[PDB]
Design a protein around this ligand. Structure first.
Ligand SMILES: *[C@@H]1O[C@H](CO)[C@@H](O[C@@H]2O[C@H](CO)[C@@H](O[C@@H]3O[C@H](CO[C@H]4O[C@H](CO)[C@@H](O)[C@H](O)[C@@H]4O)[C@@H](O)[C@H](O[C@H]4O[C@H](CO)[C@@H](O)[C@H](O)[C@@H]4O)[C@@H]3O)[C@H](O)[C@H]2NC(C)=O)[C@H](O)[C@H]1NC(C)=O
Ligand SMILES: *[C@@H]1O[C@H](CO)[C@@H](O[C@@H]2O[C@H](CO)[C@@H](O[C@@H]3O[C@H](CO[C@H]4O[C@H](CO)[C@@H](O)[C@H](O)[C@@H]4O)[C@@H](O)[C@H](O[C@H]4O[C@H](CO)[C@@H](O)[C@H](O)[C@@H]4O)[C@@H]3O)[C@H](O)[C@H]2NC(C)=O)[C@H](O)[C@H]1NC(C)=O
Ligand SMILES: *[C@@H]1O[C@H](CO)[C@@H](O[C@@H]2O[C@H](CO)[C@@H](O[C@@H]3O[C@H](CO)[C@@H](O)[C@H](O[C@H]4O[C@H](CO)[C@@H](O)[C@H](O)[C@@H]4O)[C@@H]3O)[C@H](O)[C@H]2NC(C)=O)[C@H](O)[C@H]1NC(C)=O
Ligand SMILES: *[C@@H]1O[C@H](CO)[C@@H](O[C@@H]2O[C@H](CO)[C@@H](O[C@@H]3O[C@H](CO[C@H]4O[C@H](CO)[C@@H](O)[C@H](O)[C@@H]4O)[C@@H](O)[C@H](O)[C@@H]3O)[C@H](O)[C@H]2NC(C)=O)[C@H](O)[C@H]1NC(C)=O
Ligand SMILES: *[C@@H]1O[C@H](CO)[C@@H](O[C@@H]2O[C@H](CO)[C@@H](O[C@@H]3O[C@H](CO)[C@@H](O)[C@H](O)[C@@H]3O)[C@H](O)[C@H]2NC(C)=O)[C@H](O)[C@H]1NC(C)=O
Lengths: 132, 102, 45, 53
């Protein structure tokens, strides 16, 4: 399992930041783990961004969890055949300059109660530096 | 939120313990990140280790404080350690990170 | 709404006429199951 | 409303020329048993009219 990030490393202010993770060795359709992102500002701690999974229940076509503050300005996307993850951040500010890591979330994902619980990050990515 | 000490240095060979306060559930996990590199899962489900992670690392919990213990420190153990937990309905939070220096 | 909830178990082997004939194995259904039904009547004793 | 929340999976295992048994694979999702809800208000009205008749 290898995660390869690709996309623009330099984006202009007020524009749309786009990044794409390429999974190798595992399927994104697989319901065993959630797929999302974790950003690390140059020095500060790890902050949860969000994650999703297409493996749904009877009332939805999938699950997508967003960090309450970034919800309005973010969009998460999964391409299942190509095993690719997409991340779009609108209206980026100098506070968003960070090393973004592609994260695979483990937890009570395969056998949960009421709702899926992604918790520990078993597989990380190399990450990329995004400068605003 | 999750809170961790800024540093917790120790000489090689000594048994060392780091803590994490603020956990409300058992979805506690520990990741190791070397300087300029990527994090690696080292502890999940409070105390479980991924295959290939040395057995010197152990995880325990007392009350609302989780703890990681290393018996026999090595020079390659110097890194930034992060804690993570599930809170609220489905939210995930981390600690500030602790710089373990040999 | 405060709708009452009733627990239901599932069988895949049923014998409504095993003696007249044979038993039936209901094949498993992949995925989650959900049907909405009008309850129009009752049978009492 | 009746639901079986378990996300079962079907495993077709061949047991002879042409014959194929459909086994139950490992569960995906919750460990919840099937159930049915009925609106308590409507069922209380209906039960009242029932006891009247
Ligand atoms: C119970 O658990 C099972 C797991 O076994 C779930 O099945 C998965 O369902 C998800 C969708 O919820 C599938 O993801 C989809 O993958 C498609 C690629 O084909 C694969 O999956 C299909 C079955 O869906 C297989 O038949 C096929 O062989 C491949 O394995 C994509 O084409 C789908 O895209 C569609 O949905 C996405 C959602 O965002 C849209 O964006 C797309 O435009 C498009 O509409 C989708 O990505 C997953 O592959 C399934 N796995 C398996 C093993 O079948 C069940 O969904 C779950 N029960 C319920 C009720 O959800
Ligand atoms: C038969 O009875 C069962 C229970 O006995 C019902 O099961 C429930 O179904 C509902 C769906 O209508 C589920 O509701 C979900 O709740 C999630 C959490 O909300 C809780 O938390 C908030 C804030 O703390 C409370 O205010 C709230 O009251 C709840 O306590 C929501 O997050 C879900 O929303 C989803 O949709 C939105 C918009 O699409 C998304 O943005 C969300 O991320 C999320 O995906 C959802 O509303 C409830 O959890 C179920 N309960 C159980 C125990 O499973 C059946 O619905 C009912 N009818 C049948 C079976 O037909
Ligand atoms: C389960 O019960 C629900 C009610 O609890 C029921 O929903 C109702 O079904 C009836 C049909 O029996 C619907 O009535 C029809 O609605 C359509 C669309 O509005 C109308 O076009 C129809 O009118 C034609 O039929 C009439 C004869 O009844 C003609 O006189 C008329 O000129 C038209 O040709 C008809 O009225 C009703 O709308 C729904 N209710 C709701 C809220 O939608 C459901 O059908 C039941 N399930 C089953 C499987 O029977
Ligand atoms: C079994 O499942 C049924 C569904 O298959 C359940 O019926 C549904 O019940 C919900 C409430 O729990 C209803 O939702 C209501 O919708 C009305 C009307 O919505 C319209 O108007 C609003 C503006 O008011 C608009 O914004 C919408 O877009 C719609 O155009 C709301 O006013 C209510 O507040 C409520 O949200 C569903 O409408 C209803 N289904 C149908 C087809 O009517 C049923 O309750 C379930 N029973 C049990 C026992 O669980
Ligand atoms: C019901 O029981 C069967 C067997 O008793 C279970 O199948 C077993 O599932 C495990 C995974 O939980 C398999 O382990 C993995 O197998 C792969 C095969 O290549 C291996 O490469 C991995 O390293 C790992 O060991 C196991 O092979 C499989 N079969 C057996 C004989 O153990 C099944 O999961 C059970 N169902 C439920 C719902 O628990």
């Amino acid at each position: 399992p290898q995660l390869q990030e690709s996309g623009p490393t330099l984006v202009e202010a007020s524009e749309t930041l786009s990044l794409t993770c390429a999974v190798s060795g595992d399927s994104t359709a697989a319901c065993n783990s959630f797929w999302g992102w974790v950003r690390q500002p140059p020095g500060k701690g790890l902050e949860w961004v969000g994650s999703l999974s297409h493996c749904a229940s009877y009332w939805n076509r999938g699950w997508t969890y967003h960090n309450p503050s970034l919800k309005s300005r973010l969009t998460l996307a999964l391409d299942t055949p190509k095993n690719l993850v997409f991340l779009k951040l609108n209206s980026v500010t100098a506070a968003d300059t960070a090393t973004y890591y592609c994260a695979r979330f483990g937890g009570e994902v395969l056998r949960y109660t009421d709702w899926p619980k992604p918790a520990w990050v078993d597989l990380w990515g190399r990450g990329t530096l995004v400068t605003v | 939120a999750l809170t961790q000490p800024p540093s917790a240095s120790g000489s090689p060979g000594q048994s060392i313990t780091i803590s994490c306060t603020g956990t409300s559930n058992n979805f506690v996990s520990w990741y190791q990140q070397h300087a300029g590199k990527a994090p690696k899962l080292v502890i999940y489900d409070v105390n479980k280790r991924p295959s290939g992670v040395p057995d010197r690392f152990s995880g325990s919990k007392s009350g609302n404080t989780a703890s990681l213990t290393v018996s026999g420190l090595q020079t390659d153990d110097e890194a930034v350690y992060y804690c993570g937990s599930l809170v609220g309905n489905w939210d995930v939070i981390f600690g500030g990170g602790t710089k373990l220096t040999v | 709404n405060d709708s009452i909830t009733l627990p239901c178990r599932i069988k895949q082997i049923i014998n409504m006429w095993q003696r007249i004939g044979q038993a039936m194995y209901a094949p498993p259904i992949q995925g989650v199951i959900r049907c909405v039904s009008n309850i129009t009547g009752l049978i009492l004793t | 409303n009746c639901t079986r929340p378990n996300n079962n999976t079907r495993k077709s295992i061949r047991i002879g020329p042409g014959q194929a048994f459909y086994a139950t694979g490992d569960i995906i999702g919750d460990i919840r048993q099937a159930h049915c809800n009925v609106s308590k208000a409507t069922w209380n009205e209906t039960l009242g009219k029932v006891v009247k008749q």
